[model samples]
Target chain A: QSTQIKIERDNYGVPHIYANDTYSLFYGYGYAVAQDRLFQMEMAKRSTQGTVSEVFGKDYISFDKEIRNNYWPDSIHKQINQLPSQEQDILRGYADGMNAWIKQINTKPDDLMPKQFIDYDFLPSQWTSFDVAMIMVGTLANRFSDMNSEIDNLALLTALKDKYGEQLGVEFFNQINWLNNPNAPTTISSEEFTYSD
Target chain B: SNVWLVGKTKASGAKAILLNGPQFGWFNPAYTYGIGLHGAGFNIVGNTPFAYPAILFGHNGHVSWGSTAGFGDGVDIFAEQVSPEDPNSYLHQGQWKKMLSRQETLNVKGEQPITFEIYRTVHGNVVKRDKTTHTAYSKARAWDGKELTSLMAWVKQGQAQNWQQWLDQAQNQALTINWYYADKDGNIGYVHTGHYPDRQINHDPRLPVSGTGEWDWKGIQPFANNPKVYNPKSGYIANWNNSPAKNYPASDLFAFLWGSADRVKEIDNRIEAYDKLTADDMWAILQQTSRVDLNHRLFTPFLTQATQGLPSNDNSVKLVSMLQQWDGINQLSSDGKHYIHPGSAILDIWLKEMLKATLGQTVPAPFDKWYLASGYETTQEGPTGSLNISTGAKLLYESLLEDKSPISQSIDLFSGQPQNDVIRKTLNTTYQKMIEKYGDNPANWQTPATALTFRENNFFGIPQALPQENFHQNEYHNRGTENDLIVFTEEGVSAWDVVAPGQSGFISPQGKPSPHYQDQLSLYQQFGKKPLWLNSEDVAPYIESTETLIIER
Candidate 1:
């Protein structure tokens, strides 16, 4: 169940959302974000799930395939149940809140809908917890944290080892790579810590 | 990614200021969402990802915090031994285990749908598999299946009122990020957050290790062992994706990107020089530091010292002296008519030529080419952006500085040629290139600033549909998508933040733009900031309109 949500737009359109509880607070968040960036939201979700080709067509097939291969699989969606109960509630309320705006857009005139909807000859879909999860994982998880450079590093090592031979090659490789320079400035200059077995 | 927290003792007004500047790719309606959430014991003003109900960067009544991506190794690549008889199973220890499999479908409009199979092992997902060699490579991320748990941590962090409560949530942050904290009690703190793997001592983390159960991660690194600091003798904390502590190792994937001597030097120097800094002084520092070419400030002096004995008429000396005489500021003019420093164009070209003269032929072909012209670091041939010092240029500077190389084990970077000849030849090439592009006169080199501009891009060129003056301001440097500044005083907490372009991309049904669409453009363009009202009384006068939603559930 949810409660009343108050959204006041400041001079710069920064939303001040006031609600009675956590679910309602996030509910207002979803509604406000949809009201402002429905087109962006749709595009982002499609990008995460590798379904852009479903809307834009064959030109995006390669991109869709790459994303499908790298980011998402059907199994990840089922993992949503693993979230804590409060986070689950927040996800549910957020979806319902987005659907509320989408419902109003359905009743309203075509102009009220995002320009992209008309231009692209499509309509926005009902929100889902999976879609929200995809955006978060896409933005925060994949973009910020995913670090895959092994193949590149292997090529680099192969080149160096070939250019200079085994022992000297490894030495030169270490030099060029410069793995750790303790002299570099640190944000917090104090007792250091490293990975311990 | 720049962040700093100033303690009360360093402040002119005897208050704290937390400056947060996290960079992201450019976009319309900006990449970050701004909001004020007030209800159910949550009073936070901050920015977050659009769909998430978490305040990633924000301040509450008693505390303020910000974050920058840290260079921590939280991922690994494993070489799995596929079964010679069956491709669907891989060998683990002495037994064969079936690799988990799933089918995914991608539909293209007005065409046939594409279906593919994704495979995973106990280690993680199988990104690449070789049918002939019976070998497969899988990417194992530390936080692969725990994103939801971290999201819950984000939610809990928002409700925290003090350092311990907030830190309890931060401990679970598996993302490679650094969190900066400042409170009303004049306490400042820093924590580099990530779930790092404790691997076997003999296994090298820099490359793919065998996954036949011999080489595996022991467990997660304890949070207490992660890099962190409480109030040190220094009065502030500053970082620009640099190292997190005295001897914190660089990420295995992004080796050598750390340990740059110049990125945070200017800010650290400015803060250290100030007898007592005010909020106004901090704002001035941000504006002034925006134009400093960090790499140039550090490496240009070597060029200057090299050219000290060159003939006056020699173009190398002329250009090098021009760089030496002027401050190392590199940016467009206030009116965008010209560059602030004439030396910018020269330094940009000279750095490229110096790399070509030294390591251009020694390194492999395309790698050399990529290292030379890897333009913006975004859509690049490689990571050759000016933000991080290039490996080639760093080698040249170090070889010149210490008179020999520690990393290369006494091998001359210039292949045994005298240092002056190499420096002279490189500068001559730079002078010739500059003349060919900017004409014969060195005085007109400022015109090359036009070559330094970055274009604004968005989904489907949607931002281009709006009026050019309001929507597309293309002539600028790529600083960051947004910035936040906070000041904590005895009176209360006052803060300001700016999101590039504007806060929204909304247009009404009448086709009129939203009042907030490009409202923050001018402010962001000039490095100005808008008030982030944390109190209801402060927000009342700024309220333009309001809406009430009845959540019937």
Candidate 2:
């Protein structure tokens, strides 16, 4: 925690972060990004959890709904656990350093925080140890576009149904569902709870 | 990766000229960074990410190189039968096998942590399952084979010497690429590198197969056996994401599908008179938006006859002349760049309709709705590639246009009328959409180009507060993105490169923007480039700014 981490911004404002340990390196990276890109990063994580509406209001409710509906949030902890111990440590360090930057803005609001914060009168949210982990998943969930595909697949289903009769259409539809639907291992979970083993 | 390696045989002097323009895209965190990694035996810089500790595209004082994507079929889907007793279990190799599983719990900022599961089986991870046979489908991946070794090779390959060393360095890479290498020795080579599984089983890898022990991966294709060529008689090696066009003995084994041949001809046409090429010459060639729709040779004459009924003032007549000029252009310009020519759009749609109609007329089944025919139009003519145009269709469609019984066609349906009639009528249908899209003025069609794919924020949920570098589909912008030319001259290894939206955070939400964002963007749009001057003396003149970070105990 006491490791010295430093970041320098060149004439172009590209941050060059340095630290003795790899963990510290990411911590500096977290701090450098948290300095400028905190709002974007926080909004993304919020959207992943269907909490964007909580921050920005109800306009994003349906989008949050789709975001929440698509992901298996339970998978994030497992992803962290599957990593090597060093990665887990690096992520935690990144979270701590990120929170430090967030705290700095609160302590020195005028100097550290940007004008947008005062303009919106909104504060930077405190990141959890898991926030660092979830950002990766939240990003994946926000981006994964599973719903885009879920609908696109139906366009084909309708096309197929239009080409063939309802019997064949329904049959192929069920066949597509059968092909897509996977019974999760007892140790895992599914999109919707099915008759599980 | 579009790479050009001019061998010593073709070099202006004893040093080879290497131009490596990696076809990469996207917005923030950018694709790769500009970094000076001064470490032990690793002093280099090029296009790679903050996380990737490899100089993927760069020039060492010794050798300069670049890479392009290889569309090798690197994955297969396998279906396995599951037991009724327990759904989690599947039948493989005549025995019931249990899947590997993991549960991950995600902690949100202010919300409760949510958890989910991941299941894995022998063929690879179980991505899906078929319900009819109670079967589970898994994805067998190529990247998983020897990826660590590959990353290491990428890191260490900055020091690679000969062609054999380049192969030795990059052989374990599972991500297939056409590696273009050139050095001070005037030695150059194009190495098609990947760790492809030499699966012994011969069943179609294109479709999901029943999982049994019968079909198992034998091993990765031997490092030496994968595609690589040293100094060739042709004096140069180039890959435009195309099949290594008979350059390698077993090239077909390396690819199933390839990119458009339009860029291939562009490359060939530029390199034809190569006694030696200058970096300036490379700068121009890399920015080339010229295209060849040789199918236009026929489509033009036929369309001149077909589209004439509209109006005398219409410049659809002009497009017939302009298109006969070249193959392809990406910008919407007077030269039919951005494929702005009127007949190009009309011909594209009409060609698709004609194929569906012709095929529908052949299938003999009661054709229901139309299929736009997603695959290539493999005509006996049309100089076979991905473009959906047929000068052959001109004559054939004309012959078929007379009939109503054998096949006639609507925009979305077909009749038993001649192919020509179906397509000829479809032209009227296709042209209406074209008229709406390109506007009614045929005169301007030959000059102003239509913006086909100049995308801005193709992304969703990106904050509107951040300035979006926006452009329109009806706009003309730069097309020569991701072009880099590494001049491996005796002076030193110098690379002039262009990356779009170059500055990582181009738009400042706080409004304190850097000149870097515009500087890089201008360079890309103006067909100019920032230099990758590897020498300290070379970089000293450009010392507009400097930042150093300290790591201490």
Candidate 3:
């Protein structure tokens, strides 16, 4: 745990952290982010871990189920365990830095913690490398790529076909759904590239 | 997100410049966290998402990179046949296979634990099970097992020293993103990076096929074929989540979610008009693009076409003339304190009234109103739908073009009346709305400064009590909040950056908020930015505070 780091806050309070190692750089990152957003981080951890009900209660039971269905924590932990050692070091140092903030907050008045914890009547829990990894995956990976609307498409197509007959219904669906409209713009100006479905 | 990559040929300063517009939402603490990393073979300045270990958008001393959403399709739904004898078993390839199942528990704060059963098929996760119908649906995600690997990809990208090194790791990224690159050598590049599963040509990508092994994915598309361009002849690259390549089909199940080319038309026109652009010119373009309604601009012609010859004395005629003469730019007057254009107010209500007259009558339930207004396909799960600006715009454009358009085939768009009558009625209704909201004078019907204000909440649900709580921002045309402008020159790399609200959201226990909190709000209001000092020597003069952390190993 021996690493020396210096965090200089610019005029706008943006941190510029210096260290001799990548691990310490990450550690300082975690510490600084937590200092500004401990509440947002804790909420994110609970939501990603599928344990929101533990603090928000059974009203979030269905939300917890959807989260658990999307992300199996046990499966995710195994995946995290299989990560490379240096990658693991980044996570480890980050969690350690967050824990350091937790320790510092505990020594002060109750107000030092986020007011949400006081309202909810609970204390912040210690963090782990798994928690950090899960939050990142939830924020980046799941938000971007997790999408499927086949059920809605099925429902719309079935209803249309029943009303307008097969050929006409398919025609209507195609008009609303512009799959490969040539009118759309492209980044590469001269390339006339088209691919098979 | 908006990205403008300028090669030295088109740059006013004769240096390659990269303008990175991160479309993450505006939040109190900001969606992106700005930081500078120096050590362990790294000297970079940029922003990363909270809790992420690597800087997702930033520049090292030698090179710089930014990103926009890739909008690639990666998930599929497979319909399965459940066994009549066992609810969990599903028939696959003519055989009844047992579905893997597990029980998960959630502990409540003051209540007892809640337990639920989750099931999975060989295809993927079983998201729905209908025992009465003996049917099940599974969601197969292409990047299911690559979450940790993708995070590692970002780590490698952060440490990459050149465009090639950065691209090598970017090939491994599973999260769909459009990566923009510019380096010290005045070279620029673009890559649409993702892991897309190739599907059968015969399968309708918008529909769920049988999960009986016949319709399974063939394999993942190779990274070589994924959209990429290296120093194109145009000398610049820009994207506002438009199509990545020519004829790139919308494989996403929500097919209409893709952005229409018109969405990026303004930016494209601006970049082309200028042979060489300065940073100030770029900032001015952002100011104009942020206020104008590009979607409405596309719809205005049809409305004008439908109402060609109204009498000059009619109020509807006056409104149409105002709209026709208007340039579609939403801005304050010369005094810089008031919105004076009657077009934004006039067009905003006209769209609503027209939708109410047409699709508002044909579609069913709440969806009838929401179809065009929500701009998404209707589902029972709230308004969770597509990304396109109101599906109605597409249908409206089609209906306006052809008498036998698909929507017309379904229902009468003009309700058996002449198109002119329907158009005139909507215009009349819009005139009435303007008169009521503003006044009888047409010029008084200007855009409201607080038309799209976002107010912060205190203690989770209470309205913010602070003076700067009611945040009025540039209208949401493109998803832009955290933004950066980096120029690569012989002297070294220099940058300017801005985050909405401020850099710090911390409030002291003594009821005092951090001084930096909301410090950058004025810059955002005025479309101004602060210097993002990258080097240690450059940052020394701007230091406001410093903290030393000692770790006892």
Top candidate by DockQ: 1
C-alpha lDDT score of every prediction, in listed order: 0.72, 0.51, 0.72
lDDT of prediction 1: 0.72
Model 1 residue B295 distance off true place after TM-score fit, in angstroms = 2.4
TM-score-based ranking: 1, 3, 2
What is candidate 2's lDDT per residue for B1-553, written digit by digit as tens?
4566676676664467777665432333233445443322444545543223445677667777787665444566667778877767887788998877766444444455555556667776666656776877776655542333454466568767666666677775555656778887788776666655676666444445677767777766666555556676677776656554332211121112221212344565677666677667655666662233434443455666655564644444344444555455444454434444544555566566665665444322332222234223322222111232232242233333334212222222234554345545766666566667667765544423333221232233534123343322233222323566776667656676655454343333355534554346545555677766555555555555443333333
Q: How close is candidate 3 to the true structure, as a TM-score?
A: 0.90
lDDT by residue (B288-336, candidate 1, tens digit) is: 5666655667767777778887688888888887777777666666766
Flag regions of model 1 displaced more than 4 Å.
A72-79, A190-197, B254-256, B331-337, B374-386, B403-411, B450-470, B508-510
Model 3 DockQ reads 0.56
Residue A189's lDDT in candidate 2 = 18
Cα deviation in Å at residue A103, candidate 1?
1.0
Of candidates 3 and 2, the better by TM-score: 3
lDDT tens per residue, model 3, B65-140: 8888787777788888888888788888778899888899889878878788888888788887667777899988
Report the Cα lDDT for candidate 2: 0.51
* lDDT over C-alpha atoms for residue B443 of model 3: 52
Query: What's each prediction's TM-score?
Result: 0.93, 0.68, 0.90
Give the Cα RMSD of candidate 3: 4.1
